[PDB]
Amino acid sequence: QELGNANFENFIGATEGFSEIAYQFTSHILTLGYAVMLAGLLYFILTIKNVDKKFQMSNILSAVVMVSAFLLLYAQAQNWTSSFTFNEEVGRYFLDPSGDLFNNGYRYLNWLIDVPMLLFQILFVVSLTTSKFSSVRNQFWFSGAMMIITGYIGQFYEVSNLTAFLVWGAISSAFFFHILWVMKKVINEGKEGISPAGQKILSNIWILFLISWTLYPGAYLMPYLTGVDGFLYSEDGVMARQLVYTIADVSSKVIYGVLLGNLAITLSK
Amino acid sequence: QELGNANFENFIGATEGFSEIAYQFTSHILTLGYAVMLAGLLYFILTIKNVDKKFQMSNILSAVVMVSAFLLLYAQAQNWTSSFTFNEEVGRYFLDPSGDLFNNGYRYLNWLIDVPMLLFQILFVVSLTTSKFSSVRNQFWFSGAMMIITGYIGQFYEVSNLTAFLVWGAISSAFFFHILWVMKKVINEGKEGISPAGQKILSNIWILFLISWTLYPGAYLMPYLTGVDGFLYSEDGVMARQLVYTIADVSSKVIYGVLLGNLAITLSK
Amino acid sequence: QELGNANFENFIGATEGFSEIAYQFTSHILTLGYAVMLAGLLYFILTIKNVDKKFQMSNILSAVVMVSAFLLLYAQAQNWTSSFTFNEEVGRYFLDPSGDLFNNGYRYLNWLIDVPMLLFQILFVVSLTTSKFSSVRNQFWFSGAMMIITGYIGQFYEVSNLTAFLVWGAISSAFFFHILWVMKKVINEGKEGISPAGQKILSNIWILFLISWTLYPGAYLMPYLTGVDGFLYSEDGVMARQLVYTIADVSSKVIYGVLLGNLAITLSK
Amino acid sequence: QELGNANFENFIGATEGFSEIAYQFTSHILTLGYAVMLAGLLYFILTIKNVDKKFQMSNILSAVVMVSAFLLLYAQAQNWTSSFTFNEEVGRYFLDPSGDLFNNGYRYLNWLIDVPMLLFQILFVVSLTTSKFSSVRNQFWFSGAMMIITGYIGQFYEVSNLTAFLVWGAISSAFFFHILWVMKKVINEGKEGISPAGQKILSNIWILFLISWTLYPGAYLMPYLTGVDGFLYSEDGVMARQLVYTIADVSSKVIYGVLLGNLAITLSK
Amino acid sequence: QELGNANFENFIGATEGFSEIAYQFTSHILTLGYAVMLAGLLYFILTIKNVDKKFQMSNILSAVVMVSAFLLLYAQAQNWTSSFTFNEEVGRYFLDPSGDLFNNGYRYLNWLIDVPMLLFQILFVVSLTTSKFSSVRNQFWFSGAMMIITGYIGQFYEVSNLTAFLVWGAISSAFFFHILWVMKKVINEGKEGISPAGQKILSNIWILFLISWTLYPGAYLMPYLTGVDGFLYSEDGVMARQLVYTIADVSSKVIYGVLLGNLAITLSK
Ligand SMILES: *C/C=C(C)/C=C/C=C(C)/C=C/C1=C(C)CCCC1(C)C
Ligand SMILES: *C/C=C(C)/C=C/C=C(C)/C=C/C1=C(C)CCCC1(C)C
Ligand SMILES: *C/C=C(C)/C=C/C=C(C)/C=C/C1=C(C)CCCC1(C)C
Ligand SMILES: *C/C=C(C)/C=C/C=C(C)/C=C/C1=C(C)CCCC1(C)C
Ligand SMILES: *C/C=C(C)/C=C/C=C(C)/C=C/C1=C(C)CCCC1(C)C
Ligand SMILES: CCCCCCCCCCCCCCCCCCCC
Ligand SMILES: CCCCCCCCCCCCCCCCCCCC
Ligand SMILES: CCCCCCCCCCCCCCCCCCCC
Ligand code: NA
Ligand code: NA
Ligand code: NA
Ligand code: NA
Ligand code: NA
Ligand code: NA
Ligand code: NA
Ligand code: NA
Structure with a gap:
C-alpha cells in the first residue's frame, strides 16, 4: 500500500501497529x-x-x-x-x-x-x-x-523525501534564530526601568521561551533523533513527539501567558 | 459517473483523486x-x-x-x-x-x-x-x-454549463463595481473632518477592502484562470481556490474589523 | 415503498429523488x-x-x-x-x-x-x-x-390523508385570525401616547408581523398551491417550502426583535 | 429476542415497532x-x-x-x-x-x-x-x-419483574409524601409576614409543585395505567410517558423558577 | 482474542459481557x-x-x-x-x-x-x-x-501484570501520604488566627479531603478488593469502580470548592 507524502505515524500504524499503551497514551496527552x-x-x-x-x-x-x-x-x-x-x-x-x-x-x-x-x-x-x-x-x-x-x-x-524534510527544516531554523535574537533584545530593553521583581520574571520568561520553543524543532526530528531504523522510529517515537508537542504548547502559551500576567500585576499601580 | 450541476472539486476527486498534501492542506486551511x-x-x-x-x-x-x-x-x-x-x-x-x-x-x-x-x-x-x-x-x-x-x-x-457560469458571474460583477463605487465615496466623505491619523487608517481600509473583495471573484474563476484542461484545472486549482477564500475571509472580516476598531479609538475622546 | 403518515419531502426523495441544486440549496438555506x-x-x-x-x-x-x-x-x-x-x-x-x-x-x-x-x-x-x-x-x-x-x-x-390535512389547517387558521385581531388592538392602543416616530415603527411592525406570519400557512400548503401533480409537487416545492420558512423565521423573530429594540430606544430617555 | 431488565419502550419497538407519528412526536417532545x-x-x-x-x-x-x-x-x-x-x-x-x-x-x-x-x-x-x-x-x-x-x-x-417495579415505586412514594408534607409547612410559614401579593404567588407555587411533581410517578406507571395488555401498553403509552415527563420537567423547573423570581421581585425594595 | 495491557472492564465485556443494568448504570453515573x-x-x-x-x-x-x-x-x-x-x-x-x-x-x-x-x-x-x-x-x-x-x-x-500494578500503586501511595501530611499542616496553621466558624469549616474540609481522596486508590484496587475470581472481579466491580470515581470527583472538586467559598465568605468583611 502506497501512503505517499504522509507523516511517519501512518507508516508505524500501517506496518507494526500501535500497542494499547502507545495508542491510549497519545489519545490522553x-x-x-x-x-x-x-x-x-x-x-x-x-x-x-x-x-x-x-x-x-x-x-x-x-x-x-x-x-x-x-x-x-x-x-x-x-x-x-x-x-x-x-x-x-x-x-x-x-x-x-x-x-x-x-x-x-x-x-x-x-x-x-x-x-x-x-x-x-x-x-x-x-x-x-x-x-x-x-x-x-x-x-x-x-x-x-x-x-x-x-x-x-x-x-x-x-518519510517520502528525507532530503526535502531537512532542507526546509534548516531554512525554518534560520528564521527561528532571528526570532530568538529579536526576543532577546525585547527582554533586555524590557528589564531597563522596571523593579528587580519585574526583571526576575522577564528572566524566567526568557528561559521558558528558549526551552519551550526549542521543543518544537525537537518533535519535528523526533523520529530520526536515534538515526534511521533507530529506537525512536517506532510507536515510542510517536508517543515522544505528541508528548513533547503537548509540553511545548502548555509552556509556550498557557504558562508564558500566566508569567506575563504576573509581570503586568508587578508593574500595575 | 453522473454528478450533474456540481462544483469542479467533485470532478477532480471523482477522476484523478487528491494527494495526501492536496487533501490535508485543504482540511487545514x-x-x-x-x-x-x-x-x-x-x-x-x-x-x-x-x-x-x-x-x-x-x-x-x-x-x-x-x-x-x-x-x-x-x-x-x-x-x-x-x-x-x-x-x-x-x-x-x-x-x-x-x-x-x-x-x-x-x-x-x-x-x-x-x-x-x-x-x-x-x-x-x-x-x-x-x-x-x-x-x-x-x-x-x-x-x-x-x-x-x-x-x-x-x-x-x-462545470455543467460554462456559459451560464460566466453570464451570471458577469451580471454579479456589475453589482460588485457599483459597491466599490459607493464604498469609495464613503471613504472620501469619511476622511473629511477627521484627524490625519484617522485618514491614514481609512486609506489602509480602502486598500484592504479593494484587494480582499477582488479575491472572491478570483476564486470563482480559479479552475479556468489557466484555460480549460489547464494547470489550475487540477487538485492544485482546488488548493488555490480554498486558500484564496480563507485569505479573503480573514482580511475582509477580521482584519477589516480590527482597522475599524482602531479608527473608532482614534476618533474616541 | 411504505412511508405512511410522512411529509411530502420523503415521497419526492423516495420516488423522483433530489438534484444537486435542490438538495444543496435546501441544506444551505x-x-x-x-x-x-x-x-x-x-x-x-x-x-x-x-x-x-x-x-x-x-x-x-x-x-x-x-x-x-x-x-x-x-x-x-x-x-x-x-x-x-x-x-x-x-x-x-x-x-x-x-x-x-x-x-x-x-x-x-x-x-x-x-x-x-x-x-x-x-x-x-x-x-x-x-x-x-x-x-x-x-x-x-x-x-x-x-x-x-x-x-x-x-x-x-x-400526503396520507389530504382531508384531515385541510380540516386541521382550517381549524388552525381560525385561531390565527383571532391572534391577528388581538395584535391589531395592541398596535392601535400602543400608538396612543407615544411620539409620531414610535407610531411610524409600530406601523412597520404590524406590516412585518402580518406578512411574515402569513408565510407559515403558505409553506404548509406549498406542495398543493399549484394543485395535485402540479409544478410545486416536486423538488421545486421542497426548495420553496424550506426557503419560505427561513424568510418567515428571520423576519418574525430577528427583524421583529430589532424593530422592537429600535422602538424601545425611541421611548427611552 | 432477549432484552432482560429493559424499559417497556424497547419491547414495543422490538415487537410492534413505532409509526412515523409515534417516533417523530417522541423526538420533537x-x-x-x-x-x-x-x-x-x-x-x-x-x-x-x-x-x-x-x-x-x-x-x-x-x-x-x-x-x-x-x-x-x-x-x-x-x-x-x-x-x-x-x-x-x-x-x-x-x-x-x-x-x-x-x-x-x-x-x-x-x-x-x-x-x-x-x-x-x-x-x-x-x-x-x-x-x-x-x-x-x-x-x-x-x-x-x-x-x-x-x-x-x-x-x-x-417489564422483567412487575412485583419489584411496584414495591420500589411504593417505597419511593413514601419519601414523596414526606417531601409534600415539609414543602406544605415551608409554604405556610412563607406566607406569614409577606404582602397579600407574595401570598398569592406562594399559593400558585404550591399548586404548580403539587401537580407537576405528581406527573413523574404518573409517567412511571404510564404503561400499566390501563392494566396489562391495555391501550397504554403500546406506542401510545410511549408518547404519553415522554410527553408527561416533558410537561413535568418544564413546569417543575423553568415555570417554578420563574414564579420564585416573581416572588423575589415582590419582596425586593 | 488478545487485549494485552488493557483495563479489566474490557476483559469482563469481552468474556461475560455486561447486563442492561450494569451497562446503563455505568453510562448514567x-x-x-x-x-x-x-x-x-x-x-x-x-x-x-x-x-x-x-x-x-x-x-x-x-x-x-x-x-x-x-x-x-x-x-x-x-x-x-x-x-x-x-x-x-x-x-x-x-x-x-x-x-x-x-x-x-x-x-x-x-x-x-x-x-x-x-x-x-x-x-x-x-x-x-x-x-x-x-x-x-x-x-x-x-x-x-x-x-x-x-x-x-x-x-x-x-490485568496483564498484577505485580507491576501493585508496585506502582505502592510507590504512588508514598507520595499520597506526603500530600496528606503537608495538607494536615496547612489545615492546622490555617485554623490559627481565624474565628471559630472558620475553624469549624476547615475541620469539615479536612474530613472531606481525607475520605474523598482515599476513594481514588480504592477504585484502583476495586477489581481485586475481593481477591482474584472474587465477587468484585465482575460487572459488579465495574459499576462499583465508576460509581466510587464519580462520588470522589464530585466531593473532591465541587463540594471541596463550595466549602472553600463558604470559608472565604466567613473571612470576608
Ligand atoms: C504555541 C505555538 C508555538 C510556540 C509554535 C512554535 C513553533 C516553532 C518554534 C517551530 C519551529 C520549527 C523549526 C525551527 C524547524 C522545523 C519546523 C518548525 C516549524 C517546527
Ligand atoms: C466576508 C464575505 C465577503 C467579503 C464576500 C464577498 C463576495 C464577493 C465580493 C463576491 C463577488 C462575486 C463576483 C463579483 C462575481 C462572481 C461571483 C461572486 C459572488 C464571487
Ligand atoms: C417564529 C415562529 C412563528 C412566527 C410561527 C408561526 C406560525 C404560524 C403563524 C402558523 C400558522 C398555521 C396556520 C394558520 C394554518 C396551518 C398550520 C400553521 C400552524 C402553519
Ligand atoms: C426536575 C425533576 C423533578 C421534579 C423530579 C421529580 C421526581 C419525582 C417526584 C419522582 C417520584 C417517584 C415516585 C413517587 C414513585 C415512582 C418513582 C419516582 C422516582 C418517579
Ligand atoms: C479531582 C481529582 C483528584 C482528587 C484525584 C486524586 C487522585 C489520587 C488521590 C490518586 C491516588 C492513587 C494512589 C494513592 C495509588 C493508586 C494510584 C492513584 C493515582 C489512584
Ligand atoms: C518560500 C515559500 C513561500 C512563502 C511565501 C511568502 C509568505 C509571506 C508571509 C508574510 C506575512 C507576514 C506579514 C508581516 C510583514 C509586514 C507586516 C506589515 C503590517 C503592518
Ligand atoms: C517516574 C516518572 C518520571 C516523572 C518525570 C518527572 C516528573 C515531573 C514533575 C514536575 C513537577 C513540577 C513541580 C515541582 C516544583 C517546581 C515548580 C516551580 C514553580 C514554583
Ligand atoms: C464531612 C462530610 C464527609 C462525607 C463526604 C464524603 C462523601 C463520600 C461518601 C463515602 C461513601 C462511598 C462508598 C461507596 C460504596 C460503593 C461500594 C464499594 C465497594 C468496596
Ligand atoms: Na480508534
Ligand atoms: Na475523509
Ligand atoms: Na446526505
Ligand atoms: Na424557539
Ligand atoms: Na433513528
Ligand atoms: Na439537572
Ligand atoms: Na454502546
Ligand atoms: Na480536570
Missing part, C-alpha cells in the same frame, strides 16, 4: 492538550480586571491564542482516534484509511496565528528603549510566518 | 478558517469598552459577522473531509458520495448576511458629508444581495 | 437559518444596556427565542442531510431510511414556545389603554398554542 | 425539552440583577438546574433516535440494538441533582417562622435522594 | 459526572463577587478545575458507550473493538492538572504561620505529579 487550553481561556478572561487597563491587551491576546488552540488541538485529537482502529486477532491499533491519514498539519496552522500573537503580546507589558515598536513587531510577524510555512512544507516529506 | 473567526469574535467582544458608546455598534456587527462566519465555515470544513475518502490501493482521496458532493454554497450564504453588515458597520464610525446615510445603506444592501444571489446560481454550473 | 439565530442571540444580549431597564425584558425574550430557535433549526438542518444520500448511478439524492424520515416537526415545536414569547414581548415596549395586560396575554397564549398544536397534527397527513 | 432548559438558563442569568442580592441565590440555583437538565435531557433525546431505525418493508421504526437499548435513566440522574436544588432554592426567597432552615434542608435532601434512588431501581424491572 | 462539573463551573463564576478580591482566586481555580473536568469526564463517558455494543442473541453488551478499548486514562491525566490546582487554591483562603507558601506549594505540585504519573503507569497492568 492530546485530550489533556485541548482541555488545558479551554481552562486557560477561562483564567485569562476572569483575571482581566486584575491589571491596569494598559496591560489588559495581554490577557485578551492570551485568550485569542487559547480559543484557536482549543479548536485546532481538539480536531488533532480526533484526527488520531479516527485514523487508527483496533485489530482483535493481533490486539494492536492499525491505520484505518476510512478515517483519513493522521497529519500534524492542524497543529502547524495553530502556530501560524499563535506565534504572531504570542510575540506581539509581550510588547504591551514591557517598554522598548532604543528599539522601535513597529520595527520589532514586523520582524517577529515576518520571520514567524516564514518559520511556520517552511516547516509545514518539510513535515509532509519526513 | 478550512480548519484555520473557522478557528480565526471564533478568535476574532472573542476579541471584538473584549474590546467593546475601548471606544465611545457611539462607535460600539461597529464591534457588535463585527461579532455578529464572526459568529455566522464560524458556523457556515465550520460546516464547509466538514463538507470537505466527509466528501473525500482515502483509497489504500492507489493512495489518493476519491469522491465518497455517501458523504454528499462538496459545494462552496455554505460560504456563499455566509457572504449574503455578512456583505450587508460589513458595508453597514463603517457607517457607524465615519460621518457622510454630501451622501445620505439611508441612500448609501440601501445601495450597499441591494447591490450586495444581487451580487451574492447571481454568483450563487452561476457557481452550480462552473 | 437551513444552515443560514440557525446561523442567523445565533448571530441575533449575540446582538440582543450586547444591546440590552442600550434601552431603559423597563424595556430590557424585550431583549431578554428575543434572546430566549433565538437560543431555542438555533437548537431546533440546527437539528432540522442535520435531519435533512441525514434523510437523503447521493446515488452515483443516477446522480440524485434519494431517501435514506437509516437516517430517519424528514419531518417539519422540529420547526412546529420551535413555534410552540416562540409564538407565546414573540406576542408577549411587545407588551413590555407598548402601553395598552382600554385592554387589560393579563387579558391580551391569555388570549395570545391560548390561541397561539391551539394554532400550533392543530397545525402540527395536520402536517402529518399532508 | 424530547428536543423541545432540552431546548426549553437552555432558554431558561439564559433567562435566569439575564434577570439576576432584577432582585435584591439576598434573593439572587435563587436565580443561580435555577441556572444550575437548567445546565445539568440540558445536558442529561439532550443525552436522553439522542438515546431515543439512536435506539430505533426505520424499516422500509413495513414502514415502522424497530429497536436497533447497535444504538443501545433506550433507558429513562439519564432523566432519573437529572432529578437526583435537581430535586435537592429545587427544594433548597425556595428557602432563599421565603422566611421560616417555627421551622429550622438546616432541619428542613436535611429532610428535603435525604427524602429527595431516597425517592430518586429507589425509583431508579424499580424502573429497570417495569 | 458517567453522564451525571460531567453534568455536575458544568453545573459547578456556572456556580463558581456567578458567586465570584460574593467574596473579597483577595479570595476570588479560589473561585477562579475551582472554575478552571470544572472546565477541564467536564471535557475529560465527557470523553471518558463517550469511551464507555463506544467500547460496548448490545448482542441481540444473548442480550448483553460485549467489547466492540471498532470503538477502541475502554481506558480510565482520560480521568488520570484529568487529575494531573486538577490535583495541583485543588491543593494550591486552599493557600489563597487560609494563612500559613511557620510554613512558607512557596515551600508547601512546591511539595504539593511535585508529590501530586509523581502520585498521578506512577498510578497512570500501574493502571495499564491491572
Whole structure:
C-alpha cells in the first residue's frame, strides 16, 4: 500500500501497529492538550480586571491564542482516534484509511496565528528603549510566518523525501534564530526601568521561551533523533513527539501567558 | 459517473483523486478558517469598552459577522473531509458520495448576511458629508444581495454549463463595481473632518477592502484562470481556490474589523 | 415503498429523488437559518444596556427565542442531510431510511414556545389603554398554542390523508385570525401616547408581523398551491417550502426583535 | 429476542415497532425539552440583577438546574433516535440494538441533582417562622435522594419483574409524601409576614409543585395505567410517558423558577 | 482474542459481557459526572463577587478545575458507550473493538492538572504561620505529579501484570501520604488566627479531603478488593469502580470548592 507524502505515524500504524499503551497514551496527552487550553481561556478572561487597563491587551491576546488552540488541538485529537482502529486477532491499533491519514498539519496552522500573537503580546507589558515598536513587531510577524510555512512544507516529506524534510527544516531554523535574537533584545530593553521583581520574571520568561520553543524543532526530528531504523522510529517515537508537542504548547502559551500576567500585576499601580 | 450541476472539486476527486498534501492542506486551511473567526469574535467582544458608546455598534456587527462566519465555515470544513475518502490501493482521496458532493454554497450564504453588515458597520464610525446615510445603506444592501444571489446560481454550473457560469458571474460583477463605487465615496466623505491619523487608517481600509473583495471573484474563476484542461484545472486549482477564500475571509472580516476598531479609538475622546 | 403518515419531502426523495441544486440549496438555506439565530442571540444580549431597564425584558425574550430557535433549526438542518444520500448511478439524492424520515416537526415545536414569547414581548415596549395586560396575554397564549398544536397534527397527513390535512389547517387558521385581531388592538392602543416616530415603527411592525406570519400557512400548503401533480409537487416545492420558512423565521423573530429594540430606544430617555 | 431488565419502550419497538407519528412526536417532545432548559438558563442569568442580592441565590440555583437538565435531557433525546431505525418493508421504526437499548435513566440522574436544588432554592426567597432552615434542608435532601434512588431501581424491572417495579415505586412514594408534607409547612410559614401579593404567588407555587411533581410517578406507571395488555401498553403509552415527563420537567423547573423570581421581585425594595 | 495491557472492564465485556443494568448504570453515573462539573463551573463564576478580591482566586481555580473536568469526564463517558455494543442473541453488551478499548486514562491525566490546582487554591483562603507558601506549594505540585504519573503507569497492568500494578500503586501511595501530611499542616496553621466558624469549616474540609481522596486508590484496587475470581472481579466491580470515581470527583472538586467559598465568605468583611 502506497501512503505517499504522509507523516511517519501512518507508516508505524500501517506496518507494526500501535500497542494499547502507545495508542491510549497519545489519545490522553492530546485530550489533556485541548482541555488545558479551554481552562486557560477561562483564567485569562476572569483575571482581566486584575491589571491596569494598559496591560489588559495581554490577557485578551492570551485568550485569542487559547480559543484557536482549543479548536485546532481538539480536531488533532480526533484526527488520531479516527485514523487508527483496533485489530482483535493481533490486539494492536492499525491505520484505518476510512478515517483519513493522521497529519500534524492542524497543529502547524495553530502556530501560524499563535506565534504572531504570542510575540506581539509581550510588547504591551514591557517598554522598548532604543528599539522601535513597529520595527520589532514586523520582524517577529515576518520571520514567524516564514518559520511556520517552511516547516509545514518539510513535515509532509519526513518519510517520502528525507532530503526535502531537512532542507526546509534548516531554512525554518534560520528564521527561528532571528526570532530568538529579536526576543532577546525585547527582554533586555524590557528589564531597563522596571523593579528587580519585574526583571526576575522577564528572566524566567526568557528561559521558558528558549526551552519551550526549542521543543518544537525537537518533535519535528523526533523520529530520526536515534538515526534511521533507530529506537525512536517506532510507536515510542510517536508517543515522544505528541508528548513533547503537548509540553511545548502548555509552556509556550498557557504558562508564558500566566508569567506575563504576573509581570503586568508587578508593574500595575 | 453522473454528478450533474456540481462544483469542479467533485470532478477532480471523482477522476484523478487528491494527494495526501492536496487533501490535508485543504482540511487545514478550512480548519484555520473557522478557528480565526471564533478568535476574532472573542476579541471584538473584549474590546467593546475601548471606544465611545457611539462607535460600539461597529464591534457588535463585527461579532455578529464572526459568529455566522464560524458556523457556515465550520460546516464547509466538514463538507470537505466527509466528501473525500482515502483509497489504500492507489493512495489518493476519491469522491465518497455517501458523504454528499462538496459545494462552496455554505460560504456563499455566509457572504449574503455578512456583505450587508460589513458595508453597514463603517457607517457607524465615519460621518457622510454630501451622501445620505439611508441612500448609501440601501445601495450597499441591494447591490450586495444581487451580487451574492447571481454568483450563487452561476457557481452550480462552473462545470455543467460554462456559459451560464460566466453570464451570471458577469451580471454579479456589475453589482460588485457599483459597491466599490459607493464604498469609495464613503471613504472620501469619511476622511473629511477627521484627524490625519484617522485618514491614514481609512486609506489602509480602502486598500484592504479593494484587494480582499477582488479575491472572491478570483476564486470563482480559479479552475479556468489557466484555460480549460489547464494547470489550475487540477487538485492544485482546488488548493488555490480554498486558500484564496480563507485569505479573503480573514482580511475582509477580521482584519477589516480590527482597522475599524482602531479608527473608532482614534476618533474616541 | 411504505412511508405512511410522512411529509411530502420523503415521497419526492423516495420516488423522483433530489438534484444537486435542490438538495444543496435546501441544506444551505437551513444552515443560514440557525446561523442567523445565533448571530441575533449575540446582538440582543450586547444591546440590552442600550434601552431603559423597563424595556430590557424585550431583549431578554428575543434572546430566549433565538437560543431555542438555533437548537431546533440546527437539528432540522442535520435531519435533512441525514434523510437523503447521493446515488452515483443516477446522480440524485434519494431517501435514506437509516437516517430517519424528514419531518417539519422540529420547526412546529420551535413555534410552540416562540409564538407565546414573540406576542408577549411587545407588551413590555407598548402601553395598552382600554385592554387589560393579563387579558391580551391569555388570549395570545391560548390561541397561539391551539394554532400550533392543530397545525402540527395536520402536517402529518399532508400526503396520507389530504382531508384531515385541510380540516386541521382550517381549524388552525381560525385561531390565527383571532391572534391577528388581538395584535391589531395592541398596535392601535400602543400608538396612543407615544411620539409620531414610535407610531411610524409600530406601523412597520404590524406590516412585518402580518406578512411574515402569513408565510407559515403558505409553506404548509406549498406542495398543493399549484394543485395535485402540479409544478410545486416536486423538488421545486421542497426548495420553496424550506426557503419560505427561513424568510418567515428571520423576519418574525430577528427583524421583529430589532424593530422592537429600535422602538424601545425611541421611548427611552 | 432477549432484552432482560429493559424499559417497556424497547419491547414495543422490538415487537410492534413505532409509526412515523409515534417516533417523530417522541423526538420533537424530547428536543423541545432540552431546548426549553437552555432558554431558561439564559433567562435566569439575564434577570439576576432584577432582585435584591439576598434573593439572587435563587436565580443561580435555577441556572444550575437548567445546565445539568440540558445536558442529561439532550443525552436522553439522542438515546431515543439512536435506539430505533426505520424499516422500509413495513414502514415502522424497530429497536436497533447497535444504538443501545433506550433507558429513562439519564432523566432519573437529572432529578437526583435537581430535586435537592429545587427544594433548597425556595428557602432563599421565603422566611421560616417555627421551622429550622438546616432541619428542613436535611429532610428535603435525604427524602429527595431516597425517592430518586429507589425509583431508579424499580424502573429497570417495569417489564422483567412487575412485583419489584411496584414495591420500589411504593417505597419511593413514601419519601414523596414526606417531601409534600415539609414543602406544605415551608409554604405556610412563607406566607406569614409577606404582602397579600407574595401570598398569592406562594399559593400558585404550591399548586404548580403539587401537580407537576405528581406527573413523574404518573409517567412511571404510564404503561400499566390501563392494566396489562391495555391501550397504554403500546406506542401510545410511549408518547404519553415522554410527553408527561416533558410537561413535568418544564413546569417543575423553568415555570417554578420563574414564579420564585416573581416572588423575589415582590419582596425586593 | 488478545487485549494485552488493557483495563479489566474490557476483559469482563469481552468474556461475560455486561447486563442492561450494569451497562446503563455505568453510562448514567458517567453522564451525571460531567453534568455536575458544568453545573459547578456556572456556580463558581456567578458567586465570584460574593467574596473579597483577595479570595476570588479560589473561585477562579475551582472554575478552571470544572472546565477541564467536564471535557475529560465527557470523553471518558463517550469511551464507555463506544467500547460496548448490545448482542441481540444473548442480550448483553460485549467489547466492540471498532470503538477502541475502554481506558480510565482520560480521568488520570484529568487529575494531573486538577490535583495541583485543588491543593494550591486552599493557600489563597487560609494563612500559613511557620510554613512558607512557596515551600508547601512546591511539595504539593511535585508529590501530586509523581502520585498521578506512577498510578497512570500501574493502571495499564491491572490485568496483564498484577505485580507491576501493585508496585506502582505502592510507590504512588508514598507520595499520597506526603500530600496528606503537608495538607494536615496547612489545615492546622490555617485554623490559627481565624474565628471559630472558620475553624469549624476547615475541620469539615479536612474530613472531606481525607475520605474523598482515599476513594481514588480504592477504585484502583476495586477489581481485586475481593481477591482474584472474587465477587468484585465482575460487572459488579465495574459499576462499583465508576460509581466510587464519580462520588470522589464530585466531593473532591465541587463540594471541596463550595466549602472553600463558604470559608472565604466567613473571612470576608
Ligand atoms: C504555541 C505555538 C508555538 C510556540 C509554535 C512554535 C513553533 C516553532 C518554534 C517551530 C519551529 C520549527 C523549526 C525551527 C524547524 C522545523 C519546523 C518548525 C516549524 C517546527
Ligand atoms: C466576508 C464575505 C465577503 C467579503 C464576500 C464577498 C463576495 C464577493 C465580493 C463576491 C463577488 C462575486 C463576483 C463579483 C462575481 C462572481 C461571483 C461572486 C459572488 C464571487
Ligand atoms: C417564529 C415562529 C412563528 C412566527 C410561527 C408561526 C406560525 C404560524 C403563524 C402558523 C400558522 C398555521 C396556520 C394558520 C394554518 C396551518 C398550520 C400553521 C400552524 C402553519
Ligand atoms: C426536575 C425533576 C423533578 C421534579 C423530579 C421529580 C421526581 C419525582 C417526584 C419522582 C417520584 C417517584 C415516585 C413517587 C414513585 C415512582 C418513582 C419516582 C422516582 C418517579
Ligand atoms: C479531582 C481529582 C483528584 C482528587 C484525584 C486524586 C487522585 C489520587 C488521590 C490518586 C491516588 C492513587 C494512589 C494513592 C495509588 C493508586 C494510584 C492513584 C493515582 C489512584
Ligand atoms: C503592518 C503590517 C506589515 C507586516 C509586514 C510583514 C508581516 C506579514 C507576514 C506575512 C508574510 C508571509 C509571506 C509568505 C511568502 C511565501 C512563502 C513561500 C515559500 C518560500
Ligand atoms: C514554583 C514553580 C516551580 C515548580 C517546581 C516544583 C515541582 C513541580 C513540577 C513537577 C514536575 C514533575 C515531573 C516528573 C518527572 C518525570 C516523572 C518520571 C516518572 C517516574
Ligand atoms: C464531612 C462530610 C464527609 C462525607 C463526604 C464524603 C462523601 C463520600 C461518601 C463515602 C461513601 C462511598 C462508598 C461507596 C460504596 C460503593 C461500594 C464499594 C465497594 C468496596
Ligand atoms: Na480508534
Ligand atoms: Na475523509
Ligand atoms: Na424557539
Ligand atoms: Na446526505
Ligand atoms: Na439537572
Ligand atoms: Na433513528
Ligand atoms: Na480536570
Ligand atoms: Na454502546
